[PDB]
């Protein structure tokens, strides 16, 4: 095989390198806004990219977001809520040392660490209606600070809550003040949440506190012929109708032996010479693996 991260049809991939899908979407400070790459044939991920979420925390339904973005082939990274003029009574310039970028501190580029202004954090009710006629991927976060002092210096309320509502999605959060062990130099975490939002649907955010509010959001063309390849290799320009993680394929045979996770008008996998799940989904993985494995035998008669 061609051994390079070629182009499927002249349309170029997206290279996150030391970024990750977790950080890409959150807009990791050590990462381009990637506005340069709002369209691709495939996403490229390194086996364990170091700089994903610059701030520690659990990215809820991460393994599902990866999958719904696998099909996606383009965004429209709009400022669902402008940093200025959307939050006149909130401080939007929050930053953390954990999210350093060419400097002592910063924060994600697709979220706003809302904190009080004039020592006041007013119960917010911001809302947005998807008039863009295509599904909108919204992201937000809830901050689980390591102590009551940080909670009440940022958000000025103790029994804080968050609430997110849309036509067929309602969830309410009460974040816990847990003094977790230090990771990336920080104790408290930022549990990150995502929801799709149908055309014409509207999403309502509400919070007494602890909201890591959305700045941007992806009105995204669900598309097909995409996926999160994972591999380390050069990115040189080259052409073939099918990509695999270690290289593209020109059609000498419709048979592939290269790494399963494949994208494009690709041959069939064999062994004869991309989804993921968490730990509480082993059943689901052994499904997928089994699903795969049997086909992989069937393909080599």
């Amino acid at each position, epitope marked *: 095989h061609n051994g390079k991260l070629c182009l499927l049809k002249g349309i170029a991939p997206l290279q996150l390198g030391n970024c990750s899908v977790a950080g890409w979407i959150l807009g990791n400070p050590e990462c381009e806004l990637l506005i340069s790459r709002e369209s691709w044939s495939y996403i490229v991920e390194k086996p364990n990219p170091e700089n994903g979420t610059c701030y520690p925390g659990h990215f809820a339904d991460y393994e599902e977001l990866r999958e719904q973005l696998s099909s996606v082939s383009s965004f429209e990274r709009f400022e669902i809520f402008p940093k200025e003029s959307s939050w006149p009574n909130h401080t939007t310039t*929050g930053v953390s*040392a954990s999210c350093s970028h060419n400097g002592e501190s910063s924060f994600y580029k697709n979220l706003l660490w809302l*904190t009080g202004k004039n020592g*006041l954090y007013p119960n917010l009710s911001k809302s947005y209606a998807n008039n863009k006629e295509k599904e909108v991927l919204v992201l937000w976060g809830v901050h689980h600070p390591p102590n009551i002092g940080d909670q009440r*210096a940022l958000y000025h309320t103790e029994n804080a809550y968050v609430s997110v509502v849309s036509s067929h999605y309602s969830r309410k959060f009460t974040p816990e003040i847990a003094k977790r062990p230090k990771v990336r130099d*920080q104790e408290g975490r930022i549990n990150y949440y995502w929801t799709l939002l149908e055309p014409g649907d509207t999403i309502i955010f509400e919070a007494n506190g602890n909201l890591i509010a959305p700045r941007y959001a992806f009105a995204l063309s669900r598309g097909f012929g995409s996926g999160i390849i994972n591999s380390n290799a050069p990115m040189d320009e080259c052409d073939a109708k099918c990509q695999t993680p270690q290289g593209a394929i020109n059609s000498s045979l419709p048979f592939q032996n290269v790494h399963p996770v494949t994208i494009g008008e690709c041959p069939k996998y064999v062994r004869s010479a991309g989804k993921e799940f968490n730990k509480l989904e082993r059943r689901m993985e052994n499904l997928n693996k089994k699903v795969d494995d049997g086909f992989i035998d069937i393909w080599t008669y």
Partner: antibody
Amino acid sequence: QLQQSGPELVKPGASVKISCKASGYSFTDYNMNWVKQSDGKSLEWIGIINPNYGIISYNQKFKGKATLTVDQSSSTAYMQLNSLTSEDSAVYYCARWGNSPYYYYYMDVWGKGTTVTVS
Amino acid sequence: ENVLTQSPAIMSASPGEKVTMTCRATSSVSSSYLHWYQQKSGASPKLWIYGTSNLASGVPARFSGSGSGTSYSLTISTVEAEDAATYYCQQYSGYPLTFGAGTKLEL
């Protein structure tokens, strides 16, 4: 407890830095206040530094004229006065927001205060 | 916006005597966020009430408090000459956490 820099004498316009460092508790956990007190006068809230997240906030009386920061490793907080004038000749305290449920924004321990003086 | 005035400016008193001093807020203050600090002769103040009624460590029961909204009260059942000092009221109503200029005991 809290320990503080020493008394200082300066001319106007000469910016100057005060410090105070903790002991007997985890520095990073509790928030840092700074508070002026002129001689026998009112004493007023400069602003806070949240040591953990570096989220400063100021009283708009002092905004800009004061700048606050911290160092975790030194367990220390620092307060910078810019564009000094005579009425800044006072005792500056730093303090700490003790942690408690349902009650907060109290200052349960104080440094001994530094007489920074303009003459 | 907020600012507080407290009274009396100075109290004349005798040892063994009861008192209550008042802090009034120009804007509303929750009873959970008003506090009172001891302060003597230019030394570092001390926290002696921390919940509008709750008493800190190192301060006798005599010290008491009460109130709501825009009016709050510190109270002593017995003053003693070496125990008396200036008392500063404090609150959160947003920022700034401006104090009330301390009342003073001439005792």
